[PDB]
Structure formats: C-alpha cells, structure tokens
UniProtKB/Swiss-Prot annotation, chain A:
Lineage: Eukaryota, Fungi, Dikarya, Ascomycota, Saccharomycotina
Protein name per its UniProtKB record: Small ribosomal subunit protein uS4A
Keywords for the protein's UniProt record, in alphabetical order: Cytoplasm, Isopeptide bond, Nucleus, Phosphoprotein, Ribonucleoprotein, Ribosomal protein, Ribosome biogenesis, RNA-binding, rRNA processing, rRNA-binding, Ubl conjugation
Any GO BP: ribosomal small subunit biogenesis
Further remarks about this protein from its record: Present with 106000 molecules/cell in log phase SD medium.
SUPFAM superfamilies per record: Alpha-L RNA-binding motif
Swiss-Prot record, chain B:
Family, as annotated: Belongs to the class I-like SAM-binding methyltransferase superfamily. BUD23/WBSCR22 family.
Subunit: Interacts with TRM112. Interacts with ECM16.
Origin: domain of life: Eukaryota
Signal peptide from the UniProt entry: none
Motif Nuclear localization signal in this chain: 17-24
More about this protein: Present with 1620 molecules/cell in log phase SD medium.
Cellular compartments annotated: Cytoplasm; Nucleus
Name of encoding gene: BUD23
Region (Disordered): 16-35
Native species: Saccharomyces cerevisiae (strain ATCC 204508 / S288c)
This protein's name: 18S rRNA (guanine(1575)-N(7))-methyltransferase
Curated annotation (Swiss-Prot), chain D:
Cross-link (Glycyl lysine isopeptide (Lys-Gly) (interchain with G-Cter in ubiquitin)): 20
PTMs per UniProt: N-terminally acetylated by acetyltransferase NatA. Also partially acetylated by NatC.
Superkingdom of the organism of origin: Eukaryota
Entries under SUPFAM superfamilies matching the protein: Ribosomal proteins S24e, L23 and L15e
Further comment: There are 2 genes for eS24 in yeast.
GO cellular component: cytosol; cytosolic small ribosomal subunit; mitochondrion
InterPro entries listed in its UniProt record: eRP_eS24_sf, Ribosomal_eS24, Ribosomal_eS24_CS, Ribosomal_uL23/eL15/eS24_sf
GO BP: any one term: maturation of SSU-rRNA from tricistronic rRNA transcript (SSU-rRNA, 5.8S rRNA, LSU-rRNA)
Name assigned to this protein: Small ribosomal subunit protein eS24A
Native organism: Saccharomyces cerevisiae (strain ATCC 204508 / S288c) (Baker's yeast)
Quaternary state and interactors: Component of the small ribosomal subunit (SSU). Mature yeast ribosomes consist of a small (40S) and a large (60S) subunit. The 40S small subunit contains 1 molecule of ribosomal RNA (18S rRNA) and 33 different proteins (encoded by 57 genes). The large 60S subunit contains 3 rRNA molecules (25S, 5.8S and 5S rRNA) and 46 different proteins (encoded by 81 genes).
Subcellular compartments: Cytoplasm
Family under the similarity heading: Belongs to the eukaryotic ribosomal protein eS24 family.
PANTHER family: 40S RIBOSOMAL PROTEIN S24
Swiss-Prot record, chain E:
The keyword Membrane is assigned to this record: no
Protein name: Small ribosomal subunit protein uS12A
UniProt cross-references to CDD domains, sorted A to Z: Ribosomal_S23
Cellular localization per UniProt: Cytoplasm
Assembly: Component of the small ribosomal subunit (SSU). Mature yeast ribosomes consist of a small (40S) and a large (60S) subunit. The 40S small subunit contains 1 molecule of ribosomal RNA (18S rRNA) and 33 different proteins (encoded by 57 genes). The large 60S subunit contains 3 rRNA molecules (25S, 5.8S and 5S rRNA) and 46 different proteins (encoded by 81 genes).
Gene that produces this protein: RPS23A
Amino acid sequence: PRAPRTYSKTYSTPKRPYESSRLDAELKLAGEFGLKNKKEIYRISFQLSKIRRAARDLLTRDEKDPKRLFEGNALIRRLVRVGVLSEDKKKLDYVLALKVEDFLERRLQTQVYKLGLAKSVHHARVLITQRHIAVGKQIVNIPSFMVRLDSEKHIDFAPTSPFGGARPGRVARRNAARKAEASGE
Amino acid sequence: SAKSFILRKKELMKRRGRKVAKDSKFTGRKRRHRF
Amino acid sequence: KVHGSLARATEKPKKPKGRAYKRLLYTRRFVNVTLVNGKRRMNPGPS
Amino acid sequence: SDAVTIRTRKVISNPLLARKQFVVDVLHPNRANVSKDELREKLAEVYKAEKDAVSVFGFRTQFGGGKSVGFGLVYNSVAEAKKFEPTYRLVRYGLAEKVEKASRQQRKQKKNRDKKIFGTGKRLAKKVARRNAD
Amino acid sequence: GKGKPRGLNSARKLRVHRRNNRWAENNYKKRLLGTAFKSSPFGGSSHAKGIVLEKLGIESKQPNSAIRKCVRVQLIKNGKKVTAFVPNDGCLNFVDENDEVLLAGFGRKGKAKGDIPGVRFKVVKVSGVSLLALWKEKKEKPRS
RNA sequence: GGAUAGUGGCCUACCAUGGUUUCAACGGGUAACGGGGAAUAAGGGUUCGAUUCCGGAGAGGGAGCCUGAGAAACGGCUACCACAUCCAAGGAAGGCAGCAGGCGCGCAAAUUACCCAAUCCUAAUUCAGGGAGGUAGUGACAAUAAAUAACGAUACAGGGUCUUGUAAUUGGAAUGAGUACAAUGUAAAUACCUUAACGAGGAACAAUUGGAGGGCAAGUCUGGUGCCAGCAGCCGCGGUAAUUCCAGCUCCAAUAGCGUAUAUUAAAGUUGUUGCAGUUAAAAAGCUCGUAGUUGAACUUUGGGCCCGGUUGGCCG
C-alpha cells in the first residue's frame, strides 16, 4: 500500500508511419545529428507538441489575464534559458513557430561539436558516452543533456578522461608496457 | 487464381492513371512461406 | 543446430548497428547518390 | 590526491540529545572512495571529539567521482553516545558487541511450543517420565 | 425541422430515443447480451486450448495441390468442437492425434494468402511448444 | 404500551384505508461492490474502473450468543447443513477470500527466503511484539536513459587546384559489457555510485522481429520440383483454379525490442445534442380524431439632461 510512483511516456509514434516525405525528413535529421533511433525525433516532437499546445490555449485567453501573464512568462523564461528562442523573440506568438531542429541544436553532442572538440558529429556522441566531457565540474555521458545558455561556456574535458591529461588509458598503458620490454631493453 | 486477380486489377489503374510497378516472375507467389 | 551445453558462460562482414547504422543510411540515401536515373531508383537487379 | 578535505554543512547544535548534526561533504579527487574510518578519525580532531563519540552513517559518491556527500553526527561525552545511538551502528563501529540470537522462524516456533504448556511443566516432566517408564 | 425534438425540456425523449435505436447496432447489442459467454466457441477468451481429434484432407484440389489442410479440434473447457487452420505443409508431421494444441483466431483475410472459408482458428502452439519455433528448427516437440 | 443507547409500524393491542406509478411504479437481468479515478484527444463524447486512497460487506452456507466502551467477531463459542482429519472403534479436532505453499481450474499470475533498521501500531510500555510493513529472490505487465564503434594514413572513382565514396590496404588511440583487491551501500548481505589489476581486432564481446498489385516503404531478382494432347525441337519459351510447390538473393520499416490473437477507442458525421438519413439506394404509420409528452403571437420605464470618481491608449516626460 505504498504510494504509486507516477510514470508517463515521453514519446509518441505517428499515426501515419509510412509517408515518403516525412520518412526522408526524419532520416535527414538522424544523419546530421547522429541519432541512434527514430525515438529521438519522436521524443522532441512530443515535448515540442506539448509546448505548442500549452501556449495555444493561452492565446485563446484574453490580454492581461494573470493566468496568461504568469504561465506565459514562465514558458518564455524556460525556453530562452535553455536557448531554443533568442532574446528578440520573447513573445507567445513566436513559440508557435518553433521547429524541431531548434531543440536538436541545443543538445549536448550537437553543442560539443559546435565548440570544436569533436571533428565529426558521430565522434561527438561516442566521446560523451565514454565519460570524457564534463559540464561544469561533473562528468556527463547523456547525449540529450539540453545544454542551458549559462552552462554554454563551461563545457570542457574532465580532470579525469585521458584527453585532459591525468594517466592515459589502458590501451596505451599496455602499449607502453610492450615497447618498454621490447625497445626499452 | 491469384495471378489472374493481380493482373486484372493492375491495368485498371492504367486507365485510372496512377503509378504501379512493372512486373517480373514473383507476381503470383507466396512472398513468405508461413510460420 | 542444438545449443551448446556450456555455450552460455557466404560470409560478409557485418553491418554496423544502432547509431552507426543510421550513418550508413544517411551516406547511402542522399549525400553522394550513387545511381541516378532521374527518378532515384533504390534497388535494381542486373541494371 | 594531495590531501582529502572534509566540509561540514548545515550544522545543528542539538542539546536535546547532546549532539550536533551536520551534512558531511568530503572531496576525494583521485583515490578511490571515502575510507569511512579515516573520516571517523578526521572528524575527531576537527574540533575535539574523542573519536568513539563521533558517528557517520550515510554516504554516496557523486556520479563521475571526486565528490562524496553524507550525514555525520558527533556527540560530546561518549557515555550517552553509548545510550542514544542505535545498536547496529555501535556494532558497526565495534564499540558494542553483536548479541547472538536465533532466527525468526526458530524463535516463533519456540514461542508456540510454550503456548501449549500451562505453568512451568515441572509437574509435567515428572509426569511424563513416570508415564513413559511405568 | 430535422425530425427530432429540439426544445429545452425534451431531454427525456432524446435520452430514450437513443437507447432504443442503440439496440439496432451490432457491437453494442453483442456486448450487452454477452453472446461471448453463451454461444461463441471461445468463452469470451482470446485463446483456447484443445485436444486434436483427427486431421482432415481439406485440400486446395486433387493431386496438383496447394497443400493447406487442417484438423478437427475439441476445446477443453466448453467441450465444443471447431475446425482449425495449420500453416504450410511440413507442420502436419508435428501435429499427431491428442496433442493439446493452443489455438487463436485467424481473423483477417485478403483475396490471397489464405482464402479458406469456414475456418477462423489458426493453431499457434502444439504440445506446449510453438509452431513458429518448431517449424524454423528452434526446438523439438515431445511425442505425447 | 413494550423494546432500544435513542427517534421511528421496530414490535404489540385497537381504529382508520390508505401509500407508489406512463415524470416508468412493481417485477426481471447484470459475466453490478459504489467513488476518487483510467484509456482514447480538434470539440462534445465512447468505453472502463476486482486492484496501492475513502466508504460498504464477507470470512465454506445459514442462524444464535458470551465477554467487553466497542463484535451478531469466525487466527471466539454453540447448534444445523455440506466437506473433511486422527486413531487403541470408546472418543477428539476442524475452517489460508492473512503470509509463504500445494491440488483443481484455466489463455492467464512469483520464494514453504531475511529483518523489525525505516513507516507506523499495540502493551503494564523508550526496552517486548508485528508474514502490518520493509529488504532480497522470480519477474520483457507498464515506464525512464541509451552500448553493439570513432579517428588517421596509402591507392582508385568522383565533384573538381580543395571535398566526398570505395578497398579480404594499413596505423595507433578511447571505452564499458565482464572478472575483481578495497571502500561506499545495507539490520546483515546482493545490487547501484567510486575504483588498484585484467579485459576488442571481426567466423571478436557477431541484434532481432516483421514486410515488398495498392495500403505502403520496399524487385523490368535467382535456383530447384510437378503438370501441359500449347509453340519450337542442339536449346528453350509460355501457361500451371501447384489460390505459386520448395528454397535463396536483394530492398524497406521499427529497434532491445518486434509480431500475432481477443476486447475497446480514434479514423466514423455507421448513434449523429454539436452532427446522419427516409421520392427512386435500409426507412413517412392507409387515413383522421385525441390524453400524457414537447412547443406555443405581440404587448407594461423607453428616452433625455447633470455632475462624480475609475482603467486603457497616447500629445506629452
């Protein structure tokens, strides 16, 4: 009789799964960001639809209604601080015209690629999951991290993770062991 | 008579004006041997 | 055919799987399209 | 690591039990882990503690390593630290001794063995010895 | 107009006109009377398990054959006897007599890929193993 | 009047003849515990709710009662009924719709495990107890996050002096699935978090489930078997109510998931209040009267004047 821990789905499959226009649209997104499966596009198009639906029901409400003013400015603050909107489009009429690629641009593996450090978009993903890139001071290995605007300048290599110094990996260690017993003497 | 049916409706969509793939020797075969 | 009793403790090299498989489709589908006939065919036989 | 550092946050003087709560945070940049008994040592001369009177019980290493956070409480005057502390921590610290008792099933089966006997049974043992032999 | 009452105190007619016309449905009437519990071979069940009695030669035609023939099976709970459907040939050597198969509905049909009239119960498992895995040489069926 | 803790046809004595109903009484069915709520989304709705919370009832079926503030109690008693246990044949003992467990049923559901450390409860009470509860085992019910590789060099094919693909060409880096000192964790353990050491060159540490006349995404593919009173006759071609008979290649979708079956919802405006239809496609009573029901013409302080203090935009700052 403990309280049931609430859960909910974070993705929704499309009603029309087979259309050549959309199948090529989502595959274009998958290649240029390096997405493992189509759930990643499904997940973004789910929460994007939730943001648009919430903001759409605010727009039916009249001006200066404090429910619209409080919830609306909350929704503008959350999207700008993440970075989806710019600072010049802080209105409810612009969040309806958001695009899926705006959210994917704010990911971690997309942002670590835009900051050098990757040399390809697929190398950006596989670097992160090997526990190399640390946001601020804490090591992350989640490619859907959704880097905030303030944590943009703190993305570097961890004090661990041999690309940032500190005792290179086991493959080089066995290599250093082999040339120590062969070429060292 | 599955091969007779599949050809019969296929030139009907020539006259209706829609795309349809041109054929070969798999037209009236079980594409999948079942379970 | 039978599973080994202690197993749980032509050939073509395998396709990549997961994220790297989508990299193969994106290269194959449209970056540097291989066969072009004006309508972008996808599976020919003997040409 | 050159030296591990311990930091105490949210200190609460609690004269109700004559102790102090604090959220102990330790930074171990390289080594492996906390080594709790060294934190029991370092939290002794952090002010004045006479190390049997200090206690730490919850700890969790942060993801990726480096930082570990937990709860630790220090008494004064170890004599009532003997009293207010639970038994399982004193056994964990070795300050008390683990008593040995039977399992749950054998304790309860022993209990219902007595529940069928009225009195001490000292008459019954004399009765059944005469009953069996004669 | 429109042939129905529309004024503001006419909710009794609009409520009970719908109740009677709902009886001319098919899913609604089949649900309320509970004919799944009175007439269907499956007692409202999704699957049913039954004892095979004999195998029939319900064949496509005489010798030049598209072999799709199946068995006569009695369900174990209500005791009703139904006609089954087995997949392609090579699974008839699996299904002997009295094997206690687990069978499910067949349902969807096109104008190809199985057009046999009078059968709606494909056989999913025989002797408690499978028919997909038993056909694709994953496991073996014990003999009774 | 009696009875109850107490009102009251609750029961009793007498006296009245009432009480409900087409605004559906009464009877019948429910594979009906009620509700908070669940799924489904353009709206309204349709379907579901045995099940973590609240309320009701039952402890194999009925009934009766002791004790107590509280029980018509069943881990209390008594009787009857239905099952069923032991034996020395006289007698005695029962009630898992509590927790594990087993038989039977079925499409369909787990360990005869550890502990009161937490949450709370009971007692004469900080201390004892609790299959209440928690921990762990089984567990692809359902939900969250995302491994199965990334980079460079050489030679060709390109776009064309800078940019991509190809190769049984080549090079070193990085990492966790695993094993495991130790430490954290825990009532004690397992597991997660951290980590000394080992741990990748492909038949390694190898991803499946479905699908290709349209839906619809994906073939001017291959081989073999059987038949043709069909052409030709070194070969072959075509048909084949073989509804392709058996295999393979290629391609597409989803992906540690995927398919099937039943039920239900959307699509659906095939339940239509929003929002169907009735000449000829399902459907206007043969015709009129007429109670309930539903619906019912217009009409009665309209207009003008006075000042007052407000919330919005501005010429203004």
